[model samples]
Target: GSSGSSGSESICNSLNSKLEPTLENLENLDVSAFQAPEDLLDGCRIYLCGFSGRKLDKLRRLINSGGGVRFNQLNEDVTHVIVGDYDDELKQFWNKSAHRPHVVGAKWLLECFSKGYMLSEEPYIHSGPSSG
Candidate 1:
């Protein structure tokens, strides 16, 4: 949603071809359709279903974008990491070798928050207020 405002105007132009359903919908629909959600279970809001490897990369970008990026790989500094699947039984991530990359996920993020770790505006950058 950080599009078309002050420094975001350029971002808007660059991301115009990224299929922004909300922006495209508004431009192509009547005002009434944009009035409300209409349906709470709208598929448009369905995102982050744990099916990609880019979460870590994207989070790093946002964190660095706001002057935070720290700790190369997913370490204790990371709150959670969105991965494709937990494991075969889905208990946790697979015991692949020794280094287990814990990318931030909803559960881990909530746990980190409950543990008094302030939620990052981006929610993906692995660091504290001054971890920069």
Candidate 2:
């Protein structure tokens, strides 16, 4: 079999790539930017992914202050993932597998503080592939 263009033309596919600043650049920055509550996430090991801007600092403080374990990396060891938003790039990394950590929106963390307890992920669970 053979394929040809009627006008003797050719087709080409192109791709694009982008470079971004690494979070390491912020390492020398400040820590505990805000005071987080206590015991809001006791015994909960969580991770923050794809979060940009000053809000990240506030969330970090909340988790740390709320007695939750904050991990820099997203892995099986984590119990939950607090995404900054639905469009967060890191959302793609979550596979929604049972063996993996629970994926929830940033609102969940806030509600945990507002309600004074770790709220159910059902309400905060992200809308994504196979989130059920």
Candidate 3:
């Protein structure tokens, strides 16, 4: 004689039903947790040129935490290109580029992070004096 109990089926249904609401609750909590600070770099797609080492890692984290996207290469969608300092290669690239993104010094990012807002690029632009 074989006996089967329906208790296992009810237990499985209860667990599955509870999981969906728990997931939804977690999603809401996550959005509320990061939404405020994330707006700091909203809509910014940045490409870094002359950054490396500790500074590079810090910058990458800052951008990520502030909801900015970082790219490894230059592209049309890049809104900003950050450089450590101006140089000949940078000058030539700026001159030849058709898109001409907002090329600015790393200080701009630092300042923005410090001040907690995106400052004007006019003060941070790192182009050469001749503008060739």
Candidate 4:
């Protein structure tokens, strides 16, 4: 039950390999005043929170609920992900919690990360797509 709703404990198991969360881990795993990753608490600094009060409620219904493997290291948190709704005012989002940077969607976030683009800042609230 520690892998969110994915029903896969392997995720948590793998995360435990290096994410040794001691009381003094977060300071090393992440920056002060952390966000998300309140589950695993490892020092990898990788937090992956699912959908919460967003536009896509149904699709949001499908997400891992037990997975809570927080990270401690930065370059190691490759799976670090944050999902939130698309804000259109600043061309980004307000971050699902506080750790995630905004993007048009998770796909884009993953893409940017995959391309080795450390999020310099939060995502912008781009003009939302028209509702035809």
Best-fitting candidate, measured by TM-score? 3
| Model 4 bad stretches (over 4 Å) | 1-44, 51-81, 85-108, 124-132
Q: By TM-score, how accurate is candidate 3? A: 0.61
Q: Model-by-model lDDT, in order?
A: 0.31, 0.62, 0.62, 0.29
Scanning candidate 3 in windows of ten residues, the lowest lDDT window is: 20-29
Alpha-carbon TM-score of each model against the true structure: 0.25, 0.59, 0.61, 0.22
lDDT (10s digit) by residue, model 4, range 32-90: 12222322222323323343333223112111211223322223232443434433322
Comparing candidate 1 with candidate 4, which one achieves the higher lDDT? 1
Model 1 poorest ten-residue lDDT run: 40-49
User: What lDDT, from 0 to 1, does candidate 1 have?
Assistant: 0.31
- Which regions of candidate 1 fall more than 4 Å away from where they truly are? 1-17, 20-56, 79-84, 87-132
Candidate 1 residue pairs in backbone clash: 80-103, 80-104, 80-105, 81-103, 81-104, 81-105
For model 4, where is the 10-residue window of minimal lDDT?
58-67
The Cα error of candidate 2 at residue 81, in Å, is 0.4
Q: How much is the lDDT of residue 52 in candidate 4?
A: 37
Q: Per-residue CA lDDT of candidate 2, range 1-132, in tens?
A: 998765666654323211111223232223232223577688778878757675577567768778888887766678888875544434444554335567786667766665666779988877656645
| Candidate 2: residue 74 lDDT (0-100) | 64
Residue-wise C-alpha lDDT for candidate 3, range 53-131, written one tens digit per residue: 5456655765776788888767777788877654344455566676778888766766676567788888988765665
TM for candidate 4 is 0.22
